[model samples]
Target: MNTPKEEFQDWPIVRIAAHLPDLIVYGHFSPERPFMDYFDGVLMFVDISGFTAMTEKFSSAMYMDRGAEQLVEILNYHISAIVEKVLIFGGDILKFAGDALLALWRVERKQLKNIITVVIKCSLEIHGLFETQEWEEGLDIRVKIGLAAGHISMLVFGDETHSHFLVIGQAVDDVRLAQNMAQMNDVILSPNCWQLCDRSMIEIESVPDQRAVKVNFLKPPPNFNFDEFFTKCTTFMHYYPSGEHKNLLRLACTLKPDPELEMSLQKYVMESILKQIDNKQLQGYLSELRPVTIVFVNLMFEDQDKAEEIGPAIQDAYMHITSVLKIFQGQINKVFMFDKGCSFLCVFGFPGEKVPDELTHALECAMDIFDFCSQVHKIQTVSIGVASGIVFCGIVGHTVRHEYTVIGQKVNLAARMMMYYPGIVTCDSVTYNGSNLPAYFFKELPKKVMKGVADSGPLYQYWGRTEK
Candidate 1:
């Protein structure tokens, strides 16, 4: 009844195509066991400086399809050019957020110097993309980049329908902030990253109201040993083909020996490997340290309520609460029901790693659950608790009964806070500080003594976010 193309249209071909480069290099994908690893690497964020201004000029075009088409054409032209440079320079394209691009370069402890060398070379070339390419419309485009290198955790996140690979750490945030603070055509580096790099290759420049220094690579470092740099880059690839080192290998292959480092080997490697991979062999795996925001909703009836009514009330609550959670990209990790009480534990940043504003997402989901109970005639109230922390996420348990979930003090503390105080939404200091609470109405409560931990911690209660 349908053509082959039409039959496969409903399938996730685009997602599969998008991750083809990763699959060809990584060898496999396993959803149950997510691909993950830690690397001493650089995180870079490059953003078009004039995107907001360019789009503002066409604000009225948003309502017209033809006008929107022209805007998309302009954006695509600039983004495509930047992406080409990123791939050529041995950097892994992580994600595209609006007009900005995030990329990462992983390297061994010994190769940190070489990694910095190539990334800087790559970034400088990216800066020239705006001028070298001519846009269809007469639009002037430029970019700013921020780079920071440190230990980072990389992992895959997705479900049956789609998947994404992410790099997460303080370095990611640091680079983003640096990018936002840089001027057009400037590359800014955090002090941590700047200290590790060869100073002779880059000249430091002053930027107003910024802690990190701006850098420009006007010439090669003293002596500029291209042969030694290429040797190190090539040798970095042969260690492990199946393990995490493959990422390094791909980066090594993408680099060029020329002083300019203008050539990209990624295409050649990608094409060669794609031929070896079978479409049916693709899978997904996840295992890594993830920053997560946990939300716990405890629902129970007053003693006056009949035992029979509790069952229906919980069902109604579960349906309503879960639907609301989906709207905010939260998931119900586990739900527990007892004779007279029920508790639902939801996660904001798992299964899909590195969700921005996870704390805010968790808090908003909790408030939604809190508000949903108020309107229900049978259910008096629901207590909610929120907390944030890093946790190791993976599939655990025996062969017969295994499940994916997070294990850490953060999850346990959310339970403790919920049980300690009922009929109100309570959150730990981490969630309070991580979320944009000042914009929302919340009150600080007295410090509470938590079990096992020797310290007394502060607590906060959220009323709701204000409508600006």
Candidate 2:
């Protein structure tokens, strides 16, 4: 009963499974208009804690080889266990955003009540699993889950060459807020979810405008047995080698289980990943803390009321942005599109030869991206931020679908700075101090504390492409 029906193991499904979630490939893609429907069910964000501590241990320059191995080792372990919890109740994994997981269960209203109770029980089980984890190098795993339920738009957006499968709508926003309400090892549910749950089965409290607070151990729904239910809802169709069963691994560092398989699925990926994979040089780009200049681009468009105009505008903007990064040899990390525009992360130097003037090249890259807003219509502004430091760049996600990204304090500092300042290329002190290019000028801004960031002493605003 644990095994799937023999009909599920087909060649076409296996190939697609290599690049997507088993649930998505099976239930969604084969059906027409999968992207257009209002998918109403549960959306959960499982935030994995302890990455900073775990990363701190193996991210030193000397630990490159071991870093790659151990990072994947620990990441895959936690993800494997936690994702199984999601799978037990029929959730479809969307993306593994670094140390966090986003998954959805698009079921009908009839089972919504039971699914909610089961997921809460699942969260408590996840908490217990984390608590029981033996201290491995003082790296005790902790997780906070935010569960919400609603109708969401699941669509594929981007240009012809590149596209991102997106799950957006108010439920996403609510779940994000719900996660914000959670503390260590806590499982939080948004107001909508709290409303849907069978209150008699669990002990729960509330927060201000946010209903989640300190849920007690949850009991399973009536008549639901774990072993029986698992068999009833099993999908043994994930693409793997040998046609034999094996594995509980998640993606770590922009890498594939099979290198040859990756090339075939390489049309859309982070440039940081695409560069090395295209050059067939992934052997050298293993996980590590390396000297790098990071740029977080927040591009916003204006005066485009017509919805049809955005796709071409975004496509054009993406093309122009790609060329700018190429000129500086900047490695693109990730691109996230939104209603107004998009935000992308670009890194210079790291996973490649680091030049003495890499910081300057990054600032220049920002300048070029900034100029494009004026060069191309509908693009009103480019909110950019730059910083320099030793950072961890790697791949993370589920086996079927994964992504590459650079993460650390400096990455957040750049993102926060970009958010605070719009229509300008603002840079942190590290970026300012390391930059030696005469072509760029900077104005020192006063110290102002940025929440969740360490360095707040000084930041510089790059004075466009003009000479100092």
Candidate 3:
């Protein structure tokens, strides 16, 4: 007989993965440093009012049985608030605890208070249920909420390819501790969490306590512009396709992280471009006659068997990749791309005759993909095959049954080369044997018998991002 866990293993959980150094610092354990970090609003914890008194008043078992029933209803009410207000505000309500919840908010600073106000208001409704419905003989049970904002990294605990996907982390404990310390029926906040809010919010009373130590008052800057901040972050993310970084920026904006640190990163990137004032590198290269360079990225997700069992991880990996691609369109010619089931395809040559330095880009992109998947315990890798040659390029297939795609032997060879590299992509040997790239650009891949091919043939791989 299959339990829910066993059954859900066949169900895919749409996961989003990335590297988070700060979140890691916040106490969540993960193998790969998150390649991307998102700022979820402050973590909020809430507990049902009068839990202790009720437990004391009734026998342990009786109290527990009744508490469980009432808690379920309380959770349902809070969940509704999280889904509508918190989510709509550009944040996530991560999970629910008995008579409590954990959430992140990305709504405007101007509206951050609004979302919280709604949550508090909804919380009142939950409290009123005890009075109106006379639950457990009209015994009043209210909710106590505590909020704290801090960088947190997270990932599925077990192997994404395996049967288990449990949520585990120190951040969870810390938030629980914060909530545990809350004064009865009051919404307490940690200093870190409170800093992210706008000052004009409904007055949140601060009752001095251990949990209140982390709380602070928020005052929006005179020129505080939530839209402008969002715009800057959106613009930064738009030009930068690397989701890891965009996510970090978004998080930083949401949390209003260290401005000085952000400036340093920005300066470094700017200085890099400033050094390329002249087109000295491309000065001698042929202007327009060069053949197109196509780098085919084939991604085969964890097979259906594993995907179904840990479907959330699979969905998460897929979603993260797609989101990254949107940001990266600026770096590529165009992302006219897709996949059948788990495999994803990307085309890198068109509009521009010359291929951009693709090896490093491939590695960066592929590594990010791997990093994203790894966070969810779905250990997957990317196999990249780069081919540059003359090819008939245009949208192929019938207009009615049209698909925008490129054709020719170059495409065929590119696909074939990808096969040589196996499940992971390696530098193209075809381009190497043809002597189209610099000698230093590629290192020969260890000879191996490629599937569908009779003999063990030569393959090559490139490593450039490390030095770059």
Candidate 4:
């Protein structure tokens, strides 16, 4: 018979309970950092038109669970298509509100005009995803979009265990109100966006009971340039057909010479022009840099058969460990599964919301992992390595796949420290000092050379958890 603790461990809801709270807080996490800030950019809200009525109709057809499952499947299919297009256009998916999505294109203050143009173009393309007359199941799926550009207040709501990322202020309200103004399959643009975009390119339509002009992108404007668009914005060309790109170019090229728009366009044009002369000369991958604390957890197994037999248990261990990390709002950067064992590299700060106490949070996560693994039926021990520094983080790779990851000397040092010291949790002096936790005790070890590392420093073993 399974013990009470073992039974609770196997309960699926246990992981869900542990993960959902922190997962809702932010896609990222760090400790002691303020969670509110102001973001200036273009905000677009895409709503699934006629979904509520469709749900009512479907609800009458089958049992509760079956109908709900079917409805969710349909919604997921449509939402996934919309999200894919948003990412391809370099838009950050900020929130998914019920049956609607709120995405933003964050650009520098000087690039306001260019982002406005881009948001309009992105909205049109996203609307194209559900332009069909009806879905396969006799459900007429349509999308209504609202586009606005301005500053929005982003804040965190809820306590430590549960939280939500919210965008408030006039920008958020205006976009949502504009979304309400849209008809079925319509992309409604705010005056802010319309005023910034080239007037010749926009085709305005009247909205009943409203003075704000609504714009459409059924076709590109007369001044749209195809060649320049394809050259500068290849991301759009990847998913859309050539004709679609031409249609999009018709819209994108409408960007006239405005102070903000011109600067934004010039920046991209110069980069594109420079890259054409020497393919290797321009390094776009190394541009994005930020501070982050990387936590590497390595699982050990005694034998090959033991590893293979406990594969299911290993998966459980992964989920449990991931849950603990999520509780601290940590993001999983990489998962490397080898024949002998598996490893997970988690990140705090960067690529999400930044926080001040990332080093401290990373250390706490490592300690929690130790406690988590002890509850598992693992045959061996685990090792954790942590280091903090500036790392190059970005979305890189060809059209086939785009991945978000980090690379730098700090990441390498962390991996080396873990490999060099197998059983205990080891961290560099930088992380120790950065954490600033005086309650913890460290056992200083002699300097050791790490392979592929030119200069190596002393490593410290954390034994404070035992005392605590």
Alpha-carbon local distance difference test for all models: 0.59, 0.64, 0.39, 0.57
Q: What TM-score does candidate 3 reach?
A: 0.31
Report the number of clashing residue pairs per model.
12, 3, 36, 0
What would you estimate as the lDDT of candidate 1? 0.59
Judging by lDDT against the true structure, name the best candidate: 2
lDDT of candidate 2 over 58-109, digit per residue (tens)? 6666666577566666676677777766754556677665557777777666
Model 3 global lDDT (CA atoms, 0 to 1): 0.39
Error of 3 at 78 (Å): 7.0
lDDT of 1 by residue, 51-144 (tens): 5234434434443634333444455566666766666466666544334556777778777766777778778888877655444575457888
Q: What lDDT score goes with residue 113 in model 4?
A: 64
User: Which prediction has more favorable TM-score, 2 or 4?
Assistant: 2
lDDT of 3 by residue, 109-213 (tens): 344444443333433333344443335565444556665544443333212221111122233444566676665545555554455444463355555544353
Task: Give each prediction's root-mean-square deviation over alpha carbons.
Answer: 17.5, 6.3, 24.5, 23.8
The top-ranked prediction according to TM-score is 2
How far residue 466's Cα lies from its native spot in candidate 1, in Å, is 15
